[PDB]
Amino acid sequence: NQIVGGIGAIAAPVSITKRVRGMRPSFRQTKGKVHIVHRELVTSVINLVGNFRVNNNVSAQIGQFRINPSNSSLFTWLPTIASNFDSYRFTSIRFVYVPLCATTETGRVSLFWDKDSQDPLPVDRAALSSYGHSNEGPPWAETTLNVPTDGKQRFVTDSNTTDRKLVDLGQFAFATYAGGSNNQIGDIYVEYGVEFSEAQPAGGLTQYITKSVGATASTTGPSYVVDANINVNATTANVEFFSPGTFLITAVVYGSTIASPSMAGGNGTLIGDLPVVGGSNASIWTCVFSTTGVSTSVPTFTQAGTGLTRVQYTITRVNSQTAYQV
Amino acid sequence: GKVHIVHRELVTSVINLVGNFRVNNNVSAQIGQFRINPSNSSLFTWLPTIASNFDSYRFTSIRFVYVPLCATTETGRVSLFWDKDSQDPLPVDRAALSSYGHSNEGPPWAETTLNVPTDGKQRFVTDSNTTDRKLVDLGQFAFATYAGGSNNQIGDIYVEYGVEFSEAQPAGGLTQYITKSVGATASTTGPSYVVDANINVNATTANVEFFSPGTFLITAVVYGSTIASPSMAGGNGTLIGDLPVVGGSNASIWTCVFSTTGVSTSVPTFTQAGTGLTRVQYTITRVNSQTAYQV
Amino acid sequence: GKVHIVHRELVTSVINLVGNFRVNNNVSAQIGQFRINPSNSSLFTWLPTIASNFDSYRFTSIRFVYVPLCATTETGRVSLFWDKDSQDPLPVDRAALSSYGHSNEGPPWAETTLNVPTDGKQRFVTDSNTTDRKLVDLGQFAFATYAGGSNNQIGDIYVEYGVEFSEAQPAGGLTQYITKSVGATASTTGPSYVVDANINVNATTANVEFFSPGTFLITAVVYGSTIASPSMAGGNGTLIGDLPVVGGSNASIWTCVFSTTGVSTSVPTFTQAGTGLTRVQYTITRVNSQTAYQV
Amino acid sequence: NQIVGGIGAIAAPVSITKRVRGMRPSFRQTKGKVHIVHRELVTSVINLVGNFRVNNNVSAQIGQFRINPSNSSLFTWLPTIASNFDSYRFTSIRFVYVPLCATTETGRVSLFWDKDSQDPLPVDRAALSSYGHSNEGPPWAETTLNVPTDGKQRFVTDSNTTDRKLVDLGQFAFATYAGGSNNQIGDIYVEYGVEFSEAQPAGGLTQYITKSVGATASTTGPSYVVDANINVNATTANVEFFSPGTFLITAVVYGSTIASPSMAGGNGTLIGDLPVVGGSNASIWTCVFSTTGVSTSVPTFTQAGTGLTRVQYTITRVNSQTAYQV
Amino acid sequence: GKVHIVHRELVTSVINLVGNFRVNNNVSAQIGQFRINPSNSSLFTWLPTIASNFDSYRFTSIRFVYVPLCATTETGRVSLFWDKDSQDPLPVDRAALSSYGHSNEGPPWAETTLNVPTDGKQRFVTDSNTTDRKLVDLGQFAFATYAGGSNNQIGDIYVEYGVEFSEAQPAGGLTQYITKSVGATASTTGPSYVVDANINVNATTANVEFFSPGTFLITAVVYGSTIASPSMAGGNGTLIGDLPVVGGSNASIWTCVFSTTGVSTSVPTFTQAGTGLTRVQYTITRVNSQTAYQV
Ligand SMILES: [Ca+2]
Ligand SMILES: [Ca+2]
Ligand SMILES: [Ca+2]
Ligand SMILES: [Ca+2]
Ligand SMILES: [Ca+2]
């Protein structure tokens, strides 16, 4: 209760941390608009040593916390009920950072908001500091930013909508530029109040991406993945995720002879059987698996093959007890 | 007729030593060098890209903050102070800075602000010509640190201002032109990104490092006998482009785009070797990351 | 948090022909190239160095004016007009020319103004530019001359405006980057001080020529067989510094500071010959005069 | 905000430290007496391990925080305006110690006040504890002492005044006797209110000391240095400072042949050129330099020479842009 | 400065089938295709002849009615609904359309209206370029029918609107240009009268039918080997002029003026045979009955 002498001074403890409760969502209707407020987390920030890095990976994949109720990577409970509406408006939203490391962890972190959604995620240390809404902060003290709202209603991303910039409240991000260690530091909570209007039949929750050696990116659906998948001719069909959760996939390739997908030795763990067939001109392989984060080498599938023409996947989110013949 | 911007940006990092007294992260203190003026590119880093398109200013309110970066277990004393004329000499011992009328010390694990009083008069922005550079500034800012116990970056300082420009001039750009020879130094031209410190004589000696953050585009020509390639790796700043290079008999021209974090270490940024050298030139611009030389 | 800038500046020169139709000084006319947007470096000159530090703009007033820099003894009507959607394809006849919602036809020796209305909307500037640059602009400006005349310069167009920026970005650069292989249809980034008019195949063909005024700092690499030195003189643009150059075996790098103006005479500005070439790169930026090379 | 359990107890944090502001001085006149109150620092205490030590060096140089408005070693802003008066009186003065190390730094420190000014600075551990005004304290908690004032007016030390004991309010000191490490620990602030009376033409701010093999100490002016300079016959003319700041010096020696002053390899850094001439019977060398602290071996000038008779210096305080031909 | 018209015109007919679920009178539903926008010539039929002379609009109030045409003894369910973005996919079963917030069903022998809410913002009219075509529209309208028991036209739907145009553009016309080859489809240009469905390969196969009402003027060129004459009789639409025609060896050009009612059947409208064909072109304009090719 009493800190030892002297008096009236600044004291630095070993750790400070708020304790949180999982409050329920609460609804409210008003003039045909349904209003819902809730709080959940997004991710936990991890730092490197001696290297600038933003959003837990070095490629940093522009977007990826695109603030929009259809985005599953940021909101984890909102988008499965936001697919019943075609318009929204944020009435209040703030990002809360709460630490979970000791005071002896070093490396000053930051989190910030941009208004558009294709500014290519800065690399210089000085370019981070000059956003209009940010918080410089040490990695052991809580920091919160508000992000300003509008009156304009936007759309809730049911189609491809390639100029995905007029329908977004902005973009959220965070970065670290010192350190330290290679541990978790804290986790970012977001609490928010939204509106919805003009109810709709339920849209899909299934991504369909295509990739040949060319146009990247002829995709549709909610971006569980984005254009980060490597194939040229060689032992090259690499898929890796960044969004957490557990998914149901189905793949189809084309070209010369192939091999089996070697998922072992990387992120994400099997849960079923993954039946596979092919090896002459095309092959199909479906699976179901869970994954956690994360940024690392030797990515999550490394389908080799010999000489390839096209590849295309379908991704959908599903629980545990949906796998194959167990 | 008078614009009025309000912004909060970065200045520089701080680096303490093991129990001495340093002002603005060097010995010998480089008199001036943080004169607060919207064209001084060495302290502001977003402001002077628009102060080149004006001539007069008036700071309506300005404060300097200091946020921590280090662990709470590191000893130190950081201090922030302000003299109202630009070329009174900087102090040399820690006992002197208690006498400044606008000062604020504090431990390196807590935030620290100070205001700096303004006045309702207008000044000029151009500083390449005014000797003396004394009535064209609103003052002079300097920080200092005096304790142990490491050599690590233990924070940085941010400004929070409000300006009033008037009667615009045409934008000449933000490029530098740094010549150098084995002799008189250094005949700069432009803003002050970098710096009257770039070691080169005749031997394996053509060294340039930076001390301001940000991403940059540099071109350079050299002269003399056989020049080796610039091996940029090992020091501060990382390559983002392709680094084209040519020559090696009488001259060698090479462009680069990169970004540096500013904090320093040993083995500086570029470090061309060469064999026997005469002179060198540098043009430094600040530009973003999309404009990289592709491979 | 809304700055407000009022300023007046130049766009481009106007040249006419011996009795034909032409929009914006060429016949291919390259749809949308004078879209009005604060980050359009081909339209504004002083503005986009400020505009690359913000996201949301709003013109509060904008007014175009045409002054004659020509004698009163020559004929050929000029015209100014404005279209609020940014890719209607640039008409061909005289008849549909002078019937927009805002236009002012005039003779080539008289001063001619053009108001253009504003909206109370926030629009983004340009940031990794979209595929329908139509919701982000406040309109599209173009001029046209017909039934001259001669083949000389007969005036230039100035812009008065007033803007409100908001939501400050980090400092994007003002340098651009253009690569050109053989059969290229170039990829670029940053502003647009040039567009895809820079011809090269394998022969004495490595050409680039400007249209926008002002001083410039360029760097350029080439690749292939032996490369001749660039021969600047004979056409547009005047050298101001040293022009260092090296290479001639597989790749040559050269850097220039220069100033150019206005009309293209019938020869491009730099004209490297070479003997066999693969690809060329450029890095254009806008500087002032004293950032030259001093040998 | 809330310390974890239990409740109503004593908690030890990682660090405590006050944050300070550089308040301006403020003047006041009353009945012909000018009254001025101000706060500034003096030094930062550094400790050894396993050895008793007082005022950051082992020789400890009796005096050296002699509390008097002419003393530059303690007050750093006062003496340049206290040279316009011939009498003073302290109305309120306290010494404040504020920590800057972590809790894991050990070695209990102390600071104390004596009333005279030639008590020879104790060496025994027990002799430290029994001063009439002191504070035993750990090196991580703030401790303050007041020091009692009088009504008696004293003089402000414009002359040699060899019995420099009736004109002083006392003597300040501090010491450490355990540890620990070899780091800085904290710094001592002094806040004080003075008076002045009977204004004067401005006296000098220039010390002139002499030294031969004999009478030590035939000096004048403000004691920037004190009798700590070694010369006997041999390669022996050693000068080292303890007061911080930057100075203008001029030296003159006598005797047999000499050598150049080798300032490199110790405390204090060059700033100009130091022209030097001589080498037959006498030699002159001036310089200008800054120094920081400090107590170490191989002192700051080590003028060697061969066989010497006298040496005498002149010291004055001056800013940076006063050096030779740059 | 802003015009304001109020009008009530025709959209299209409705045709039910024997007990299935069809949306907008076809299977596969053709995503979009009734995006409500004054340039969408596929739903309005008097409006876009004046919306080509403007750029912006704002519907101030708009309702859609459905009047009956069939006998009262015919079973059916017609429905009218509206999604507020233009490229959400259309429903595929009758169970889905109960979830739309603005819907109104009814029997095919009674009148049925629905409103559609507006908003006070202005959009653009041009849709040849905006991908995505999503923020330039006020919504998307579609009807559907789900019962028996015939294949007859059982009504039609009418709009009743009020628009506010502003800042006119010059009238380019209303012509189409529909190229086609045995391969990629179809590279339209202009309004959407007709349609990405016109069957032709090489055999007795060059078929074009319409689905919008009105009187029209079409020209067409063909290519390949021997072409037969267009036998227009037997299908929808009646000749009103002379039908001139020429050629039959490498190409054949033919103009026609006619009117079609739109409702469909088998054996489509024109149906040229030919022998072996390469490509075909069509220009379709809407024009009245006095402009017929006389005999
Ligand atoms: Ca939607
Ligand atoms: Ca000027
Ligand atoms: Ca931004
Ligand atoms: Ca005296
Ligand atoms: Ca138009």
Side-chain angles (χ1 to χ4, degrees), chain A residues 1-234 236-326, chain B residues 1-203 205-295, chain C residues 1-203 205-295, chain D residues 1-234 236-326, chain E residues 1-203 205-295:
Chain A
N1 195 3
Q2 179 180 1
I3 308 298
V4 79
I7 50 95
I10 301 300
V14 180
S15 295
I16 50 171
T17 296
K18 284 186 176 179
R19 187 185 297 116
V20 297
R21 289 182 182 176
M23 57 90 72
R24 66 172 65 92
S26 68
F27 293 171
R28 191 182 183 174
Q29 209 177 335
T30 57
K31 299 296 289 183
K33 298 183 185 295
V34 45
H35 181 273
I36 151 183
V37 56
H38 190 265
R39 179 181 65 240
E40 67 266 16
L41 54 88
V42 291
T43 184
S44 65
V45 49
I46 61 103
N47 58 0
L48 258 290
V49 290
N51 285 317
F52 180 78
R53 198 263 304 275
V54 49
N55 297 121
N56 304 118
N57 52 2
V58 295
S59 66
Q61 292 307 111
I62 179 170
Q64 198 266 331
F65 283 99
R66 179 181 294 115
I67 172 175
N68 193 9
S70 176
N71 193 0
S72 69
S73 297
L74 195 148
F75 303 103
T76 185
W77 185 71
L78 191 62
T80 187
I81 73 168
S83 67
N84 297 117
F85 299 96
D86 274 325
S87 68
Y88 71 100
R89 183 175 67 87
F90 289 155
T91 186
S92 177
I93 173 161
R94 67 172 66 90
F95 289 94
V96 176
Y97 174 79
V98 50
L100 54 89
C101 65
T103 303
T104 187
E105 185 71 27
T106 186
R108 287 166 172 255
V109 308
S110 67
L111 46 91
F112 59 93
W113 173 67
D114 194 354
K115 189 175 174 68
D116 56 353
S117 295
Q118 284 92 19
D119 274 330
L121 288 178
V123 182
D124 281 329
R125 181 182 287 115
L128 177 142
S129 65
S130 62
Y131 283 95
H133 298 86
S134 66
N135 285 112
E136 292 178 351
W140 47 265
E142 62 177 1
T143 56
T144 63
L145 62 81
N146 298 113
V147 42
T149 63
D150 292 331
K152 184 64 66 68
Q153 297 182 358
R154 295 172 178 87
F155 291 97
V156 203
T157 315
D158 292 336
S159 298
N160 50 5
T161 179
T162 65
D163 53 353
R164 197 180 295 112
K165 186 250 203 68
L166 278 303
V167 298
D168 294 326
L169 195 271
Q171 186 176 6
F172 178 73
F174 61 93
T176 72
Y177 61 96
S181 68
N182 292 321
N183 296 318
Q184 277 73 11
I185 303 101
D187 49 352
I188 295 97
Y189 288 172
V190 47
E191 62 185 4
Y192 60 94
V194 311
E195 288 182 353
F196 292 108
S197 298
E198 300 295 329
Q200 191 188 5
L205 294 177
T206 299
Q207 193 177 7
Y208 170 73
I209 63 102
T210 57
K211 171 72 75 69
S212 66
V213 282
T216 42
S218 178
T219 69
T220 185
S223 66
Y224 286 160
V225 302
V226 73
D227 190 73
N229 45 356
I230 306 300
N231 47 350
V232 45
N233 295 114
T236 51
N238 298 321
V239 178
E240 52 90 18
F241 291 182
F242 290 110
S243 294
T246 168
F247 297 100
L248 187 277
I249 58 101
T250 300
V252 41
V253 304
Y254 288 99
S256 68
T257 62
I258 51 94
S260 178
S262 178
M263 185 175 63
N267 190 7
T269 61
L270 190 147
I271 205 65
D273 290 328
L274 58 91
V276 60
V277 61
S280 178
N281 291 318
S283 70
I284 315 296
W285 54 273
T286 185
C287 178
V288 51
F289 64 99
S290 69
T291 185
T292 169
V294 74
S295 181
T296 183
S297 66
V298 57
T300 67
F301 282 98
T302 180
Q303 176 71 45
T306 299
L308 301 180
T309 301
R310 288 178 62 192
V311 68
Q312 53 186 358
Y313 299 96
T314 173
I315 314 298
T316 176
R317 177 171 287 171
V318 69
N319 55 5
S320 175
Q321 54 271 15
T322 186
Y324 291 96
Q325 287 186 356
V326 171
Chain B
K2 292 187 286 185
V3 303
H4 182 272
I5 68 167
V6 172
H7 193 267
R8 181 255 183 84
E9 54 165 347
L10 186 275
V11 180
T12 184
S13 63
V14 295
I15 293 96
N16 52 3
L17 261 67
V18 282
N20 283 315
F21 177 74
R22 293 168 73 248
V23 176
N24 303 125
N25 294 121
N26 54 1
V27 297
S28 69
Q30 190 62 41
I31 177 65
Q33 189 271 125
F34 273 152
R35 72 284 294 255
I36 62 104
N37 188 0
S39 178
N40 191 2
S41 64
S42 181
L43 73 93
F44 299 109
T45 189
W46 177 76
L47 215 167
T49 193
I50 74 167
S52 177
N53 205 165
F54 287 101
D55 278 330
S56 66
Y57 66 96
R58 183 174 68 88
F59 283 148
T60 184
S61 70
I62 169 172
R63 72 176 67 247
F64 296 152
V65 306
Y66 167 76
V67 304
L69 191 148
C70 63
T72 184
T73 185
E74 185 170 1
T75 63
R77 298 288 290 168
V78 297
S79 64
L80 303 176
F81 59 94
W82 173 71
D83 197 0
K84 75 174 290 184
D85 50 351
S86 70
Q87 63 266 21
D88 285 343
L90 294 174
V92 75
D93 55 351
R94 80 276 305 279
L97 65 91
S98 65
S99 66
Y100 285 100
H102 301 286
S103 69
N104 195 356
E105 294 187 358
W109 48 264
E111 65 180 1
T112 298
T113 68
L114 84 166
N115 298 115
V116 40
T118 63
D119 52 353
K121 68 184 289 184
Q122 296 179 358
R123 295 178 177 90
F124 294 97
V125 298
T126 303
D127 290 333
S128 66
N129 303 114
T130 60
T131 62
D132 55 356
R133 196 180 297 112
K134 191 177 187 298
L135 284 81
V136 301
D137 294 333
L138 192 272
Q140 183 183 6
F141 166 64
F143 56 92
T145 174
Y146 62 108
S150 176
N151 301 115
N152 296 319
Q153 178 179 357
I154 53 101
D156 52 351
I157 48 177
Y158 296 90
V159 300
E160 183 176 2
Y161 50 81
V163 200
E164 288 185 353
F165 299 101
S166 64
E167 50 264 14
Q169 72 171 355
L174 296 174
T175 73
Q176 275 189 347
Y177 180 74
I178 308 298
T179 186
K180 186 70 175 293
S181 295
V182 281
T185 63
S187 177
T188 180
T189 297
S192 295
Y193 289 157
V194 54
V195 69
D196 198 2
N198 46 0
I199 304 299
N200 46 351
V201 277
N202 52 4
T205 51
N207 302 322
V208 166
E209 74 271 16
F210 289 181
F211 292 104
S212 178
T215 169
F216 292 97
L217 170 64
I218 55 100
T219 66
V221 300
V222 297
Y223 285 100
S225 68
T226 303
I227 309 103
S229 175
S231 179
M232 198 191 74
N236 194 1
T238 178
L239 189 273
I240 201 66
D242 199 4
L243 198 274
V245 67
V246 72
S249 294
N250 293 318
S252 294
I253 312 100
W254 59 282
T255 68
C256 178
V257 54
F258 68 100
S259 67
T260 177
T261 184
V263 76
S264 176
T265 174
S266 66
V267 58
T269 301
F270 289 101
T271 68
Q272 285 188 350
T275 301
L277 282 77
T278 299
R279 61 178 292 166
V280 72
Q281 296 176 358
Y282 289 97
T283 65
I284 295 97
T285 70
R286 175 172 291 173
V287 75
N288 57 2
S289 178
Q290 284 81 15
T291 165
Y293 289 94
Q294 295 178 356
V295 179
Chain C
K2 294 185 262 74
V3 301
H4 186 276
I5 294 172
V6 52
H7 188 266
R8 177 251 186 84
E9 49 171 345
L10 187 146
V11 172
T12 185
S13 64
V14 177
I15 50 97
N16 54 4
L17 284 81
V18 282
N20 281 316
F21 189 84
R22 176 175 283 177
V23 176
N24 300 325
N25 296 320
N26 53 0
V27 296
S28 65
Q30 193 58 256
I31 176 170
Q33 65 93 28
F34 282 166
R35 66 184 70 87
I36 54 103
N37 195 6
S39 174
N40 192 359
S41 66
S42 63
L43 197 279
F44 299 99
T45 57
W46 183 72
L47 213 164
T49 64
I50 292 173
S52 68
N53 296 115
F54 294 96
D55 273 326
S56 64
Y57 70 98
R58 182 173 66 86
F59 286 94
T60 189
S61 67
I62 172 167
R63 187 174 71 88
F64 296 159
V65 66
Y66 168 72
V67 300
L69 270 294
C70 66
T72 183
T73 186
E74 54 89 20
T75 58
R77 296 178 62 192
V78 308
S79 65
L80 301 174
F81 59 97
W82 172 70
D83 196 359
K84 80 175 291 183
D85 51 350
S86 176
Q87 56 267 22
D88 287 341
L90 290 181
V92 180
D93 55 351
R94 294 178 179 92
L97 191 277
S98 178
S99 63
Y100 291 25
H102 294 281
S103 67
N104 197 359
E105 53 189 0
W109 47 263
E111 180 176 0
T112 302
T113 64
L114 178 61
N115 288 317
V116 40
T118 63
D119 292 331
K121 288 176 69 175
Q122 302 294 111
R123 290 176 176 89
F124 298 97
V125 279
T126 36
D127 282 323
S128 179
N129 50 4
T130 180
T131 186
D132 49 354
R133 51 186 69 252
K134 180 175 179 294
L135 274 304
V136 300
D137 298 336
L138 189 271
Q140 178 182 3
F141 168 65
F143 64 97
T145 70
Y146 61 92
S150 66
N151 292 321
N152 298 317
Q153 179 176 359
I154 49 99
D156 52 354
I157 299 171
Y158 292 91
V159 174
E160 292 184 355
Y161 52 82
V163 293
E164 287 183 353
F165 292 98
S166 298
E167 301 295 328
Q169 281 192 351
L174 268 300
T175 68
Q176 67 173 353
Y177 176 76
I178 281 92
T179 182
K180 281 283 288 184
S181 297
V182 291
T185 65
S187 66
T188 184
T189 187
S192 65
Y193 292 106
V194 300
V195 75
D196 196 2
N198 44 0
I199 57 172
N200 45 356
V201 278
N202 54 0
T205 51
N207 292 317
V208 60
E209 50 89 18
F210 290 2
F211 290 105
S212 179
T215 65
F216 288 101
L217 167 64
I218 71 171
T219 61
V221 300
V222 298
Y223 289 103
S225 70
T226 179
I227 304 301
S229 176
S231 178
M232 183 181 176
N236 195 359
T238 62
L239 189 274
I240 202 170
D242 195 10
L243 195 271
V245 61
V246 68
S249 67
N250 290 319
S252 293
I253 172 64
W254 59 279
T255 298
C256 180
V257 187
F258 67 99
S259 66
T260 184
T261 178
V263 66
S264 176
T265 182
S266 65
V267 51
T269 59
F270 282 102
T271 70
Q272 283 189 351
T275 58
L277 281 76
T278 60
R279 59 98 62 82
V280 72
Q281 294 174 357
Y282 293 97
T283 304
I284 315 297
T285 182
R286 178 172 288 174
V287 296
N288 55 2
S289 69
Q290 71 272 19
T291 63
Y293 294 98
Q294 294 180 356
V295 173
Chain D
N1 195 3
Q2 179 180 1
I3 308 298
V4 79
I7 50 95
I10 301 300
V14 180
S15 295
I16 50 171
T17 296
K18 284 186 176 179
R19 187 185 297 116
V20 297
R21 289 182 182 176
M23 57 90 72
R24 66 172 65 92
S26 68
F27 293 171
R28 191 182 183 174
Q29 209 177 335
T30 57
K31 299 296 289 183
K33 298 183 185 295
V34 45
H35 181 273
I36 151 183
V37 56
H38 190 265
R39 179 181 65 240
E40 67 266 16
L41 54 88
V42 291
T43 184
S44 65
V45 49
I46 61 103
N47 58 0
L48 258 290
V49 290
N51 285 317
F52 180 78
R53 198 263 304 275
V54 49
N55 297 121
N56 304 118
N57 52 2
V58 295
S59 66
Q61 292 307 111
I62 179 170
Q64 198 266 331
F65 283 99
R66 179 181 294 115
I67 172 175
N68 193 9
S70 176
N71 193 0
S72 69
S73 297
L74 195 148
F75 303 103
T76 185
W77 185 71
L78 191 62
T80 187
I81 73 168
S83 67
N84 297 117
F85 299 96
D86 274 325
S87 68
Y88 71 100
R89 183 175 67 87
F90 289 155
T91 186
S92 177
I93 173 161
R94 67 172 66 90
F95 289 94
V96 176
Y97 174 79
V98 50
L100 54 89
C101 65
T103 303
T104 187
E105 185 71 27
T106 186
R108 287 166 172 255
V109 308
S110 67
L111 46 91
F112 59 93
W113 173 67
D114 194 354
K115 189 175 174 68
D116 56 353
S117 295
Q118 284 92 19
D119 274 330
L121 288 178
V123 182
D124 281 329
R125 181 182 287 115
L128 177 142
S129 65
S130 62
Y131 283 95
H133 298 86
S134 66
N135 285 112
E136 292 178 351
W140 47 265
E142 62 177 1
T143 56
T144 63
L145 62 81
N146 298 113
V147 42
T149 63
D150 292 331
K152 184 64 66 68
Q153 297 182 358
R154 295 172 178 87
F155 291 97
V156 203
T157 315
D158 292 336
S159 298
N160 50 5
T161 179
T162 65
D163 53 353
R164 197 180 295 112
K165 186 250 203 68
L166 278 303
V167 298
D168 294 326
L169 195 271
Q171 186 176 6
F172 178 73
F174 61 93
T176 72
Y177 61 96
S181 68
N182 292 321
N183 296 318
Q184 277 73 11
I185 303 101
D187 49 352
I188 295 97
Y189 288 172
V190 47
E191 62 185 4
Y192 60 94
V194 311
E195 288 182 353
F196 292 108
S197 298
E198 300 295 329
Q200 191 188 5
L205 294 177
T206 299
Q207 193 177 7
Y208 170 73
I209 63 102
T210 57
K211 171 72 75 69
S212 66
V213 282
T216 42
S218 178
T219 69
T220 185
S223 66
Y224 286 160
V225 302
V226 73
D227 190 73
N229 45 356
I230 306 300
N231 47 350
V232 45
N233 295 114
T236 51
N238 298 321
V239 178
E240 52 90 18
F241 291 182
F242 290 110
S243 294
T246 168
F247 297 100
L248 187 277
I249 58 101
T250 300
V252 41
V253 304
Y254 288 99
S256 68
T257 62
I258 51 94
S260 178
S262 178
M263 185 175 63
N267 190 7
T269 61
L270 190 147
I271 205 65
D273 290 328
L274 58 91
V276 60
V277 61
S280 178
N281 291 318
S283 70
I284 315 296
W285 54 273
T286 185
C287 178
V288 51
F289 64 99
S290 69
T291 185
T292 169
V294 74
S295 181
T296 183
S297 66
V298 57
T300 67
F301 282 98
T302 180
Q303 176 71 45
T306 299
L308 301 180
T309 301
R310 288 178 62 192
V311 68
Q312 53 186 358
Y313 299 96
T314 173
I315 314 298
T316 176
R317 177 171 287 171
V318 69
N319 55 5
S320 175
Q321 54 271 15
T322 186
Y324 291 96
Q325 287 186 356
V326 171
Chain E
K2 292 187 286 185
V3 303
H4 182 273
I5 68 167
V6 172
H7 193 267
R8 181 255 183 84
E9 54 165 347
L10 186 275
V11 180
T12 184
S13 63
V14 295
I15 293 96
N16 52 3
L17 261 67
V18 282
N20 283 315
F21 177 74
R22 293 168 73 248
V23 176
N24 303 125
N25 294 121
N26 54 1
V27 297
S28 69
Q30 190 62 41
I31 177 65
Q33 189 271 125
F34 273 152
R35 72 284 294 255
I36 62 104
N37 188 0
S39 178
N40 191 2
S41 64
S42 181
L43 73 93
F44 299 109
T45 189
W46 177 76
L47 215 167
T49 193
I50 74 167
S52 177
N53 205 165
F54 287 101
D55 278 330
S56 66
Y57 66 96
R58 183 174 68 88
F59 283 148
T60 184
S61 70
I62 169 172
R63 72 176 67 247
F64 296 152
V65 306
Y66 167 76
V67 304
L69 191 148
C70 63
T72 184
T73 185
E74 185 170 1
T75 63
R77 298 288 290 168
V78 297
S79 64
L80 303 176
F81 59 94
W82 173 71
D83 197 0
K84 75 174 290 184
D85 50 351
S86 70
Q87 63 266 21
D88 285 343
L90 294 174
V92 75
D93 55 351
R94 80 276 305 279
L97 65 91
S98 65
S99 66
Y100 285 100
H102 301 286
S103 69
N104 195 356
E105 294 187 358
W109 48 264
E111 65 180 1
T112 298
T113 68
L114 84 166
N115 298 115
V116 40
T118 63
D119 52 353
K121 68 184 289 184
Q122 296 179 358
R123 295 178 177 90
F124 294 97
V125 298
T126 303
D127 290 333
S128 66
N129 303 114
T130 60
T131 62
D132 55 356
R133 196 180 297 112
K134 191 177 187 298
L135 284 81
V136 301
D137 294 333
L138 192 272
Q140 183 183 6
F141 166 64
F143 56 92
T145 174
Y146 62 108
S150 176
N151 301 115
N152 296 319
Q153 178 179 357
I154 53 101
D156 52 351
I157 48 177
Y158 296 90
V159 300
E160 183 176 2
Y161 50 81
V163 200
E164 288 185 353
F165 299 101
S166 64
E167 50 264 14
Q169 72 171 355
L174 296 174
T175 73
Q176 275 189 347
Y177 180 74
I178 308 298
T179 186
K180 186 70 175 293
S181 295
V182 281
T185 63
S187 177
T188 180
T189 297
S192 295
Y193 289 157
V194 54
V195 69
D196 198 2
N198 46 0
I199 304 299
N200 46 351
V201 277
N202 52 4
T205 51
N207 302 322
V208 166
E209 74 271 16
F210 289 181
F211 292 104
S212 178
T215 169
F216 292 97
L217 170 64
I218 55 100
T219 66
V221 300
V222 297
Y223 285 100
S225 68
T226 303
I227 309 103
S229 175
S231 179
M232 198 191 74
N236 194 1
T238 178
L239 189 273
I240 201 66
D242 199 4
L243 198 274
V245 67
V246 72
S249 294
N250 293 318
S252 294
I253 312 100
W254 60 282
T255 68
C256 178
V257 54
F258 68 100
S259 67
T260 177
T261 184
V263 76
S264 176
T265 174
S266 66
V267 58
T269 301
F270 289 101
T271 68
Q272 285 188 350
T275 301
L277 282 77
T278 299
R279 61 178 292 166
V280 72
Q281 296 176 358
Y282 289 97
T283 65
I284 295 97
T285 70
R286 175 172 291 173
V287 75
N288 57 2
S289 178
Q290 284 81 15
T291 165
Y293 290 94
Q294 295 178 356
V295 179

